[PDB]
Design a protein around this ligand. Sequence first.
Ligand code: ATP
Ligand code: CA
Ligand code: CA
Ligand code: K
Ligand code: MG
Lengths: 356, 124
Amino acid sequence: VQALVVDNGSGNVKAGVAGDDAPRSVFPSIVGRPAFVGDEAQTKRGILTLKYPIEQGIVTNWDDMEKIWHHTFYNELRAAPEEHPVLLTEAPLNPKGNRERMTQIMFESFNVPAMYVAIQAVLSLYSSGRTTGIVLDSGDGVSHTVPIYEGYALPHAIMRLDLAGRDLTEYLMKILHERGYGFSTSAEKEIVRDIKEKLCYIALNFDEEMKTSEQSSDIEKSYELPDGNIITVGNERFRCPEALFQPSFLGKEAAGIHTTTFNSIKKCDVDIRKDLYGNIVLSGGTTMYEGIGERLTRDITTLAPSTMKIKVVAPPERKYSVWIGGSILSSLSTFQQMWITKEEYDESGPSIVHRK
Amino acid sequence: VVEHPEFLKAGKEPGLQIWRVEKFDLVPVPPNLYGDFFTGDAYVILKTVQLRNGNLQYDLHYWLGNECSQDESGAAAIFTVQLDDYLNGRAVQHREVQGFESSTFSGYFKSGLKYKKGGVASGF
Ligand SMILES: Nc1ncnc2c1ncn2[C@@H]1O[C@H](COP(=O)(O)OP(=O)(O)OP(=O)(O)O)[C@@H](O)[C@H]1O
Ligand SMILES: [Ca+2]
Ligand SMILES: [Ca+2]
Ligand SMILES: [K+]
Ligand SMILES: [Mg+2]
């Protein structure tokens, strides 16, 4: 019997079957009302007011979240939840009561036979073929740095960053306005998101790149809009992702990702830091910028002691590493013994989820 | 506690035990092929040593071939964590990459580490 794997993202839901190499269903985590779910709601942005049930990785609107899960099972996968185990993902440091609430909905509303809740960052490390390392996960809503040693995350060293892809899209939109283009609406927000993914990159040295880009026109690139018009983008290509390293660009007091990663490793016992510096694993869609590995290696090497060897790992398929890791875990011969059964829930209630 | 018939045999006496990841399961390697590794596969290795007092010491290695698929290397890592837990966390875990193995791991095989082309098909 094949389990279903569902990764609950702030931007997108990734859903599919255990044993596949990639999710078969990816759609936006949106619910619109004049109820439409996913892409249905994004095409109809006029009559509908859109709501995001997941905020910075945490479920905040349970009614709408149940509508998203219904859409996942029936409209997207065409699967009877009563006949498949379900593996669900959660963000690091997810509130305890929300893990229980998610468990109650699965057994009482969808009547699943068994389920399991896994931490997103740990799934990503397993997908890279590792048991020890530090995962930098940055998606649409939130970024985290999660040290993991011999299979288990270290909660005292997990650090959170209020800066991710959605903040970067709004920044590119603002500086393209300063450039002379008039992107503003929610629909245009989706086009600027495509520009970001297609033309942006991370400079190895920001200050030098600013002078390089002005001394020639090789920085410029053209982008065709859906209507057919063409625009040109210059130094906004590397200024936008730079906010990951200098959050002040966005009016935030937070430290950049390189400083955050460094502070996370310092919170760990000195005897394991070498294994952490040598296994910095990137995960999530916002780590997909060209040049990110080389910039991250330079900045962390500048902060870390010289006796440590810094190695940043950038898997080509890291945009879905969380889901891939769940697909592998839930396929193992030993997984039958790891999950919560409908029997155990009927006797213990939703609290059984924590000792499992 | 998670188990598996191969878990019941592991670390009961001093010696060397090698398993191969085969479509999301852990399968023992025939004893005479120990030391020959398919470049397309991943393996789990447990070295057990007896101590002066009489207690046992555990070293867990997961070896990854240059051509092994993502499902096999990911499964090898998870099985390694699960076997360590079954041993009450007493084992030390080591990641070994084809061609860059630690001196300790290479030293388990007096005839030397050898590689073969091919392997078992992926679970994906
Ligand atoms: N090639 C790319 N370059 C840069 N950013 C990208 C690229 N591809 C996707 N993104 C951004 O990655 C983000 C989505 O990644 P992800 O799908 O990992 O978010 P999530 O997992 O849905 O959110 P969270 O995990 O924080 O809840 C979006 O903001 C998207 O714009
Ligand atoms: Ca193989
Ligand atoms: Ca251990
Ligand atoms: K994230
Ligand atoms: Mg995510």
